[PDB]
């Protein structure tokens, strides 16, 4: 659950990502795969080589989902229901893996947006990604 200030910070910071959605998405994925190689087993038939077109494409999907989450922060379980079906029912992703990707998303944002990654915004983003992770790891249909 997010405070009004959290919603304000998340919308402000993620809005500055903009056209760098796919890039940041892909970078976060590649950081996760390289830092926590066990996460690669969730993508057995993917081309996970460095600079992979598939990873580029998939990072774009992740980022755009987050943009959607941000726009529907007051109705996230409804908006992310299909993504919840995928991650919670079909894939059954271990929630520890969501912590890893959320962390890598933070690392990526901090690496690219130093002026916006303040302690307050950091905290808000962390709570937001925790909210997303719970929604996607939970079966509520």
């Amino acid at each position: 659950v997010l405070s009004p200030a959290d919603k304000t910070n998340v919308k402000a910071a993620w809005g500055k990502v903009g056209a760098h959605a796919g890039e940041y998405g892909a970078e976060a994925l590649e950081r996760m795969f390289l830092s926590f190689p066990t996460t690669k087993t969730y993508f057995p038939h993917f081309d996970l080589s460095h600079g992979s077109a598939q990873v580029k494409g998939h990072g774009k999907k992740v980022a755009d989902a987050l943009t959607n989450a941000v726009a529907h922060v007051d109705d996230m379980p409804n908006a992310l229901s299909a993504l919840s079906d995928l991650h919670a029912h079909k894939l059954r992703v271990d929630p520890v893996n969501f912590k890893l990707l959320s962390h890598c998303l933070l690392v990526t944002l901090a690496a690219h947006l130093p002026a916006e990654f303040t302690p307050a915004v950091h905290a808000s983003l962390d709570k937001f990604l925790a909210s997303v992770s719970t929604v996607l790891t939970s079966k509520y249909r």
Partner: protein, 146 residues
């Protein structure tokens, strides 16, 4: 206690450019702001009500320097992290009873701080190397729970 030779080279090279007076305070301060329950362990530190209060708290910055000094000591003994943080493990586990998950959280906050300061230079391979560092530190600090 692990890390490939290349990972050790990457960690050592970057740490040489780390401001030992600032990074520790940033990391501890962000820990307290991002995970506010951690403030409970620092009630003698004074004002921790707002993010600005925390980051500007002299005692936070001072203690953060000690924390980072311990990380430096870890990096100088990467193949012996358990022994390096042995005494600290007793303090944090037996005396302070800090849940070991918080150790991992501080480690990852430090990674965010490193990323924040170095930006593009904090490459995925550099991060992966440091992820093994902070995991080793957290593990070593929770050794008295093991």
């Amino acid at each position: 206690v692990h890390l490939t030779p290349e990972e050790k080279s990457a960690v050592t090279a970057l740490w040489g450019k780390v401001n030992v007076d600032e990074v520790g305070g940033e990391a501890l301060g962000r820990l307290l702001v991002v995970y506010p329950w951690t403030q409970r362990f620092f009630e003698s530190f004074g004002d921790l009500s707002t993010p600005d209060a925390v980051m500007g708290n002299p005692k936070v910055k001072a203690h953060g320097k000690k924390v980072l000094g311990a990380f430096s000591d870890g990096l100088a003994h990467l193949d012996n992290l358990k022994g390096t943080f042995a005494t600290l493990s007793e303090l944090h586990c037996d005396k302070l009873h800090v849940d070991p998950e918080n150790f991992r959280l501080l480690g990852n906050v430090l990674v965010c701080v490193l990323a924040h300061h170095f930006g593009k230079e904090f490459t995925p391979p550099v991060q992966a190397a440091y992820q093994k560092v902070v995991a080793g530190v957290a593990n070593a600090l929770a050794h008295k729970y093991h």
